[PDB]
Amino acid sequence: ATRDQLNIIVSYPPTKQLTYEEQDLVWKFRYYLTNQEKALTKFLKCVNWDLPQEAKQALELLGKWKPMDVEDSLELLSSHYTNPTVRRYAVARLRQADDEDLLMYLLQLVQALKYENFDDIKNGLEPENLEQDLCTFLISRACKNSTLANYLYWYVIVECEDQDTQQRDPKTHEMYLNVMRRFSQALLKGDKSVRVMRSLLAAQQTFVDRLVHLMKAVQRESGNRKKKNERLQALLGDNEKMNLSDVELIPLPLEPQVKIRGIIPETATLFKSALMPAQLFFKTEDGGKYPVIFKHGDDLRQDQLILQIISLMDKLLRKENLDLKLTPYKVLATSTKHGFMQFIQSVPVAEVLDTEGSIQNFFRKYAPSENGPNGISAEVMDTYVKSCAGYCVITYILGVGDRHLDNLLLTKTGKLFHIDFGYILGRDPKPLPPPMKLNKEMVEGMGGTQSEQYQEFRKQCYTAFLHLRRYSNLILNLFSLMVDANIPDIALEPDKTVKKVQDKFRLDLSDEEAVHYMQSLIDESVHALF
C-alpha cells in the first residue's frame, strides 16, 4: 500500500514534479530509504533548503545515504538545486565516472555552469570530498585528458561569444569568460604536458580564424560556383597568406584525436546551398584524409546537441550489445556563427530516387547478391534494416520534424541516417505531423510490409525502444541541463522541453505494453502511407 506508493515515487522520472502529498510522504520515510540510491534524489527534492535547520538534517541523511549513480547525480547540477553541499556532492559523484562517460556529458555540464556560484568561479582567479565545484572539476579533469580539454575549450568559447547571452544575461556571459580565464590559468600553471595543451588550443583557434577569413574571401569572387571553387582552392594553396595547407600537426577541433597537417587545396569545393558551406579534406598526420563540412553564417548548436545525444544513444545501444549501424557524425560549433561537421560519404534518398528510382535498385546496383534478399547483399540489407529501426526510434524520441528525402541520407553499405536537425522536440513546418517518421521509400527499401525485413525492422524498433527507456533517467537528466541553453527549439518552450522527451518514453507503460504501443505507432504510420 503506502510502500507501494513510495516505490512509485522513487520510480518517477528525475524531472517529474512530486505533489505536496508525495513530498511530505517521502520526508516521513526518510530513514527507511537511506539504502535505496535511486531514492536519494527524490528526498533531496522534498527538502526546504531555505530553512537552516531542515537543510542541516537533510545533509546528514546525504552522508548516510547509499551513494547515487553518476547518471542520477546529473540531476543535482540542474537549476533546481542551489544548496552548495548538494551541488558539491553531485560533483563528487561525477568524479567516479571515467573520462569516456564524462565526455558524453560535457556539453550539458558546460551549460550547468550557469547554475554554479559565479563569485566562486571569479574568486578562483589569481590576482565524499566536496572541495571542488563544477568549474574546478571540469578544469581538473581537462588538464589530464587532451580530448576533454579540446571540447571544454570550444564548448566554453562558444558560450563566451554568444551575443544573445552577452546582451540578455551579462552576468552569465562574464561567468563563462571567467571559466575560460580559469582554464587558461590552470593550463599555464601545469606540467610541461599541460602547458603545451594551451598553445595547441591557441593554434586551433588561429586556424579556425583563418578559415573563417578564407570563407569570406572566397565570397569576394562574384562568379559562379566554379569560379568560387577556383578562388577557394587557390587561397588554400597560398599557405604563406592563408596558412591553412601546412600547419604544425594540431588536433582537429571536430575530432581532437585526429592530428592534421592542413587542408588539401585542390579538392576543396563549395556546396550548392544558400550559405555555400565548404567541403574540406584535412591532411592527417599519417598521410590520411579527414573530410569535413565547414559552415559559416549558421548556428550549429542545435545540430551539435542532437548529434551528441544520438552519439550517446548509440553508445547506450552498443553497451546493451545492440549495434544498429547508426551514423552519429561529429558536429562542433566553433562559434555561434560557424562550425565543423564530419562529412559522411553518402547520397540523399531524394537523389537516389531521381537517379535509380528506388533504394532497392540502388542497393542492387552497388551491392548485388544472387541469393541475397531481392538480389541485394544480405549484409547491406541487414545494415539498412537496423539503421532504419534505430533512426526511426531515435527521431521519434527527439521529436525531429521537417523530414524529407533531402535530409535522409544513404550509404552504399546500407547505412541510412538523418541530417539537418533544424526542427526538433515536436516542431515541424507543417501541422499534424506524423508521430513516427517512416516514409514509403523506407518501407519499399526493405521489401515492403510483406517482407520479413519489415518484421525484423519492427523487432529492432521494439528492442531499441525498450533499451533507451531503461536510460530515460540519464537522457532526461541531460535534457534538463539544457533547458536554459541558447538552442532555438528548446528556447521556444523551455518549461515543456523535458516533458516532451519524457512523454516519448511512455514510462507509464510496462515493457510488454510499450512493445504494443510501438507496434501501433509503426503500423499506423505505415497505414498512413498506404
Residue nearest ligand A1A6F (C-beta atom): 344
Residues 6+ apart with CB under 8 A from 9: 18, 22, 25, 26, 42
CB of 115 to ligand A1A6F, least distance (A): 32
- Select from 8-16, 62-70, 337-345, 501-509 the region that touches ligand A1A6F (CB under 6 A): 337-345
CB of 329 to ligand A1A6F, least distance (A): 5
271 vs 102: CA distance, rounded Å: 35
Q: Which of 346, 383, 463, 473 binds ligand A1A6F (CB under 6 A)?
A: 346
382 vs 379: CA distance, rounded Å: 5
Identify any residues that bridge with 295 across adjacent strands, giving them in sequence order: 339
Determine, following the binding rule CB under 6 A, whether residue 343 of this chain makes contact with ligand A1A6F: yes
Which position has the grid cell 551575443?
Answer: 163
387 binds, among Cl ion, K ion, ligand A1A6F, none (CB under 5 to 8 A by kind): none
Which position has the grid cell 574571401?
Answer: 217
CB of 343 to ligand A1A6F, least distance (A): 5
Among candidates 218, 247, 220, which has minimal Cα distance to 232? 218
Considering the complex, state which of residue 330 and residue 458 has its C-beta at the smaller distance from Cl ion. Answer: 330
Contact status, residue 16 vs residue 476, Cβ threshold 8 Å? no
Identify any residues that bridge with 338 across adjacent strands, giving them in sequence order: 296
Determine, following the binding rule CB under 5 A, whether residue 217 of this chain makes contact with Cl ion: no
Q: Which of 201, 309, 333, 419 binds ligand A1A6F (CB under 6 A)?
A: 419
Determine, following the binding rule CB under 5 A, whether residue 42 of this chain makes contact with Cl ion: no
258 binds, among Cl ion, K ion, ligand A1A6F, none (CB under 5 to 8 A by kind): none
| Continuous H helices in 243-377 | 301-319, 349-356, 359-366
Determine, following the binding rule CB under 6 A, whether residue 348 of this chain makes contact with ligand A1A6F: yes
DSSP secondary structure of 106-122: HHHHHHHGGGS-HHHHH
- Select from 21-29, 33-41, 378-386, 507-515 the region that touches Cl ion (CB under 5 A): 21-29
343 binds, among ligand A1A6F, Cl ion, K ion, none (CB under 5 to 8 A by kind): ligand A1A6F
Q: Which of 70, 112, 197, 482 binds Cl ion (CB under 5 A)?
A: 197
Q: How do 269-270 and 289-296 pair as beta strands?
A: unpaired
Residue 214: Cβ within 10 Å count: 25
Helix (H) or strand (E) holding 495, with range, is: helix 494-505
505 vs 513: CA distance, rounded Å: 12
197 binds, among ligand A1A6F, Cl ion, K ion, none (CB under 5 to 8 A by kind): Cl ion
CB of 300 to Cl ion, least distance (A): 7
CB of 439 to K ion, least distance (A): 11
- Select from 118-126, 241-249, 339-347, 492-500 the region that touches ligand A1A6F (CB under 6 A): 339-347
Determine, following the binding rule CB under 5 A, whether residue 117 of this chain makes contact with Cl ion: yes
What are the backbone angles phi and psi of residue 409, rounded to the nearest 5°? -110, 155
498 vs 477: CA distance, rounded Å: 8
Residue 64: Cβ within 10 Å count: 9
Considering the complex, state which of residue 106 and residue 380 has its C-beta at the smaller distance from Cl ion. Answer: 106
Considering the complex, state which of residue 156 and residue 419 has its C-beta at the smaller distance from ligand A1A6F. Answer: 419
CB of 485 to Cl ion, least distance (A): 12
CA distances from 63 to 30, 56, 57, 60, 67 (A): 13, 11, 10, 5, 8
Handedness of CA 525, 422, 253, 97 (dihedral sign): negative
Determine, following the binding rule CB under 6 A, whether residue 341 of this chain makes contact with ligand A1A6F: yes
Residue 435 burial by CB count (10 A; 0-12/13-18/19+): exposed, middle or buried?
Answer: middle
Determine, following the binding rule CB under 5 A, whether residue 369 of this chain makes contact with Cl ion: no
Q: Which of 151, 176, 329, 340 binds ligand A1A6F (CB under 6 A)?
A: 329
Residues 6+ apart with CB under 8 A from 116: 87, 133, 134, 135, 175
Binders of Cl ion: how many residues, by CB under 5 A?
A: 28
Which position has the grid cell 504494443?
Answer: 516
CB of 94 to ligand A1A6F, least distance (A): 31
Determine, following the binding rule CB under 6 A, whether residue 514 of this chain makes contact with ligand A1A6F: no
* Residues 253-312, interacting with ligand A1A6F (CB under 6 A): none
Binders of ligand A1A6F: how many residues, by CB under 6 A?
A: 7
Residues that bind ligand A1A6F in the complex, under the rule CB under 6 A? 329, 341, 343-344, 346, 348, 419
